[PDB]
Design a protein around this ligand. Structure first.
Ligand SMILES: CC[C@H]1OC(=O)[C@H](C)[C@@H](O[C@H]2C[C@@](C)(OC)[C@@H](O)[C@H](C)O2)[C@H](C)[C@@H](O[C@@H]2O[C@H](C)C[C@H](N(C)C)[C@H]2O)[C@](C)(O)C[C@@H](C)C(=O)[C@H](C)[C@@H](O)[C@]1(C)O
Lengths: 118, 114, 54, 46
RNA sequence: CGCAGACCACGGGAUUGAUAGACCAGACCUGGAAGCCUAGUAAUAGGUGCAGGGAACUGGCACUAACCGGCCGAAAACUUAC
RNA sequence: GGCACGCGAGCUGGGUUUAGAACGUCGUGAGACAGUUCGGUCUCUAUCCGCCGCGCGCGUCAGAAGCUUGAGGAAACCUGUC
RNA sequence: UCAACCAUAGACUCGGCGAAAUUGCACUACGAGUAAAGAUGCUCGUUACGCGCGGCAGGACGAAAAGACCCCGGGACCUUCA
RNA sequence: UGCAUCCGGUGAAGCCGCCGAGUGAUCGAGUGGUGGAGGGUGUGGGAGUGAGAAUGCAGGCAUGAGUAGCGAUUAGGCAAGUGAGAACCUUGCCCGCCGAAAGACCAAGGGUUCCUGGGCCAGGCCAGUCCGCCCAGGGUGAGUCGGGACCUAAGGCGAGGCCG
RNA sequence: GGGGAUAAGCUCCGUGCGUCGAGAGGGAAACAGCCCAGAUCGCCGGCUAAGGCCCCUAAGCGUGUGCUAAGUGGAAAAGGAU
RNA sequence: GGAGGGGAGUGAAAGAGUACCUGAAACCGUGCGCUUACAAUCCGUCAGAGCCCUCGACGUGUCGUGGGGUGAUGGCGUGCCU
C-alpha cells in the first residue's frame, strides 16, 4: 500500500516489514489484538490486503500470501476459514477500536479486529 | 462557613511542582467531578492526589456524617517536603548533584448546599 | 553559553505558568446500568467493555 | 586504546612491599609502626 | 484526513457522507508470473498470455472508521443636534 | 572606502607568535636572529536585547460571519549583439 | 561549477526521572549625541499591545582560567676565563 | 562577673505582631500571639563584643528549568498468568543479533554476590510484582587436581665476619 | 614658558590663581576640573546670582530705533564676488 | 496495597506522635483587598485621582489637628565596596 510517509515503524525499513508480518500472523491466529495505535493504523492497509488474496483462493495466491506471513499453519486458516467467510463483503474486513493509554510511556493503544457481523 | 473534612498525604514521593500541575485542574470542582477528571488525566502525579481526595470524602462521609453528593473541593495545596540528595557522576571527573524531591498534599472538602 | 543574570521573580513565573495541562473532555456513558464518565475518544470501546472502569 | 590504570591490584606484592615483616625490618619502618600505634590506627600496617 | 504542518496553526469531511482505508476499473512502472503442456541428455527455450506483480494519479462503490457528546458563547447609561 | 584593517559563542589555520629538528650568521657557553626550512589540540546545552518564523490572552463599548479601503512598509530596478 | 533526493541517531511532540556552568539588580528597544574617549540603564527624539514555542548568532567589551606576549618584584634550572 | 535591689509556672528568655519613643547607634518595667525557666535595673571589673564584600568557611535553598540528558554501532511483537499497579516479571509462539563470540573452562582480582523462602519508602538514569539490591536460612567434601610437607634460578634475608 | 610641527584630552616647569581631588544645590540638553554659589534640621513664606521668559518649560508670540533674506542665527581657511 | 491521614484515647500540653524542646531567614504555596495587556521603568522618591480597612464626631452618609494598604498620572533620579 501507500508507504509510510514519515520515518519507519520499528526503527528501520527492514524491521517494519518484519513487524507488520508478525502482527498480521497474530491477528489472523487470534482474531483481535491490542497494539499501539500507529501500529494498528499501519496494519489495516496491509493485513486486509492479504484477505483479498485468500478471497480468490488459488495456488498462485497461496504462494503470494506465503511470501509474507511465513507461517504455514496460519495460511491454512486464512484460506479455509477467513477466506470464504469474507467472500461477499468487498473491503473493510477490519475495524479499529481505540482503548486506554499505556501506563508506562502513555502510548496510545488501539484494538484491531475482524468484522464478524455477517 | 460549611462543615468540612481534611486529608493529608505527607511525604509523597512526587515533586511538589509536579503535583501542582495536576491540582490546578481540580480546584473548586465537586468531589464526584474531581475523581472522574483525575482518573482520565494522563499524568502519573494524579494517583497520589486522587487517593487523598477520595480519603477526604471518606473522612467526611463516616467521621463526620455529611452526604457524599454535597461535597466540593474547597482548598487543595501541595507543599514541599524533605529532599534527599544523590550524586550523578559526569565527564572529566566532575560530580553533579541530583535532588530527590518529596511533597505533602492537603485537601479540604465542604458540604455546600446546592 | 550561560545565563548572564539571575532571572527575576516576575520573569520566572511568567514563563513557568505556561507549563500546564488541559483537562480532558468527558462524556457520560452507561455501562451495566451505572453512569460513568469517559472521554469521547473512548466512547465506543467502553460500550463493548474494552475499557476497564475502576 | 590503552586504558591501563595505575593500580593493578595484587596481594603477594602488597604484603611484600608494604607488609608488616618488611616494616619491622628496618629502623625507619619500626618508627612507622610505632607512630601509627600512637595515633590509634586500627590497621598498623598494610 | 490534506500537496497544510516542528507543536500550535491553516484547509476539507463528519451518515442529509466520497474525508481516509479497503474493493472494482482505468492510467502508469516493470517486462512475459505460478501451474501445465511441448522440444532438448542438460543448462534452457516455445505455447497457454500485453501474462503477472504493483504504492502515491483518475473514476465508481458506504464495506470499515468519522460516534446514542462535551465545553465556551449576546447590551450601565448620559449630553447636545436633527 | 567605512562597518573592532565588518564578520572565528558562524567555518578553515596556510601565515604569524610555545614546546621538536636543521642550515647560514653572532656568542668561548647556556643560547639568539622583524633570516630560512619540515611538523605542531580552534572549547561552550542561548538567560537578555537583536533578528527570522508560529501561536495563547485581551482590546477595538452587545455576540458573531463574509468581503474590503488602505495610512505605513517590504521586493524589484542590470544589460549586450545583430 | 551548483546543488538535489532517500533512511537512520538527535533535534521537534506526549508520559516518567531530572542535572550544569553563570548569576549585584530588573515590567533589560533603536538613532544622534554625552560620559573612564565602543551606553538596555544618561540627554533629546523615533518606534514599540501582555505571555509564550522553534530557529540564527550581531551585542551584553558573553562563559572558562587573579594574561603564558610586555614591564616591575621574587624564584627555579642551565652556562661560563662572574 | 563584685555588690544592692526588683520581676518570674498567676508564665522568664527567645521568636512573630500592634501602638508608639529618642538628635544616632537604638528603646518600650507599653501591650497581643507562640513559648516553658530563668531575667531587669544602679554602680564598678573584664571582653573570643557589632560583617556586605577577603574569586572568604560550613549548612540550607534559589536562577538556568520542569530545560539537557537517560550511556552505541542487534529489534522487538503477540496470547495467557500473577498482581492493587505490568512495554520492562513469568510461560508459550514468532522475529532478530553474536557464533576465533556477545559460546564453554581457568589464573590474578573480588568476598557470600551462589541456592531456597521472603520484601518492594533506600538503589536501578523511568515504573517494576524483578534484580548482582535488603532480610533470614542453606551451600564449598580430594592419597591422585593448583600449592605446602620435595628441589632450585633472578632476588631477598643472612650465624660468624669484614668495612664504617 | 621650555620640548613638539609654536599638534595633541601630550609632556615638564612658575602663580597668597581657581575648582575637582575631598563638594552637594542652579546653569551649560546629557557632561569631576567651565559659570553662579559652600548643604546644622524643618516650613505648601519672601528677594536674588549665573541662566532665561512662543509650546515642551518656570517667567515677555515686552517697548523704541534700526540691520539680515542667508534658516545667517543654529560650525571653518587662503581667496572669489555689481 | 502500603506510606500517610480522620475520628476515638494517653497526656497539663499531640501549636510534645519516636520525621518528636523552643522553631527565625532564604525558598515554596494557598485565600483575601488594591493595581496592571498603547507601554521605555538602578525599580525609588515628592506631589497625587480612585478603591478597600480602621478611630472619632455629626444620620440614612458626611467631615477630621485623623491612622493604614494599594497605588492611575506628573516632576526628579547613572547600583554597594575596593
Ligand atoms: C578541548 C577542551 C579545551 O578546549 C580548548 O582546547 C580550547 C580551544 C582552548 O584554546 C586553545 C587553542 C587556541 C587555538 O585558542 C583557540 C590557542 O590560541 C590557545 C592555546 O587556546 C581554551 C579556550 C584556552 O583558552 C584560550 O586561552 C588563551 C590563552 C586566551 C584565549 N582568548 C580568550 C584570548 C582563550 O580562548 C584555555 C586557557 O586552555 C581554557 C582553559 C580554561 C582550559 O584549560 C579548559 C578547561 C580546556 O580544557 C578546554 C576549554 O576544555
Amino acid at each position: 500500500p501507500k508507504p509510510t510517509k514519515g520515518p519507519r515503524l520499528g526503527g528501520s525499513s527492514s524491521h517494519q516489514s518484519a513487524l507488520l508480518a508478525n502482527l498480521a500472523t497474530s491477528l489472523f491466529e487470534h482474531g483481535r489484538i491490542k497494539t499501539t495505535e500507529p501500529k494498528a493504523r499501519a496494519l489495516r492497509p496491509y493485513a486486509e490486503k492479504l484477505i483479498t488474496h485468500a478471497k480468490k483462493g488459488a495456488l498462485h495466491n497461496r504462494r503470494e500470501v506465503m511470501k509474507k506471513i511465513r507461517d504455514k499453519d496460519v495460511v491454512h486458516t486464512l484460506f479455509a476459514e477467513i477466506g470464504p467467510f469474507y467472500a461477499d463483503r468487498n473491503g473493510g474486513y477490519t475495524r479499529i477500536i481505540k482503548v486506554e493509554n499505556r501506563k508506562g510511556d502513555n502510548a496510545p493503544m488501539a484494538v484491531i479486529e475482524l468484522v464478524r457481523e455477517k | 462557613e460549611f462543615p468540612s473534612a481534611t486529608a493529608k498525604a505527607r511525604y509523597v514521593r512526587v515533586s511538589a511542582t509536579k503535583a501542582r500541575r495536576v491540582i490546578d485542574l481540580v480546584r473548586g470542582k465537586s468531589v464526584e467531578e474531581a475523581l472522574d477528571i483525575l482518573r482520565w488525566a494522563p499524568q502519573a502525579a494524579s494517583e497520589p492526589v486522587a487517593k487523598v481526595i477520595a480519603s477526604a470524602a471518606a473522612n467526611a462521609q463516616n467521621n463526620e456524617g455529611l452526604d457524599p453528593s454535597t461535597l466540593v473541593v474547597a482548598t487543595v495545596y501541595a507543599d514541599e517536603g524533605p529532599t534527599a540528595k544523590r550524586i550523578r557522576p559526569r565527564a572529566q571527573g566532575r560530580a553533579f548533584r541530583i535532588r530527590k524531591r518529596t511533597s505533602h498534599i492537603t485537601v479540604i472538602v465542604e458540604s455546600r448546599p446546592p | 553559553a550561560v545565563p548572564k543574570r539571575r532571572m527575576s521573580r516576575a520573569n520566572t513565573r511568567s514563563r513557568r505558568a505556561q507549563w500546564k495541562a488541559e483537562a480532558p473532555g468527558l462524556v457520560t456513558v452507561s455501562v451495566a446500568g451505572q453512569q460513568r464518565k469517559v472521554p469521547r475518544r473512548l466512547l465506543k470501546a467502553a460500550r463493548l467493555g474494552l475499557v476497564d472502569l475502576d | 586504546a590503552k586504558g591501563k590504570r595505575t593500580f593493578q591490584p595484587n596481594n603477594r606484592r602488597r604484603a611484600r612491599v608494604h607488609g608488616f615483616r618488611l616494616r619491622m625490618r628496618t629502623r625507619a619502618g619500626r618508627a612507622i609502626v610505632a607512630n601509627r600505634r600512637s595515633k590509634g590506627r586500627r590497621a598498623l600496617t598494610a
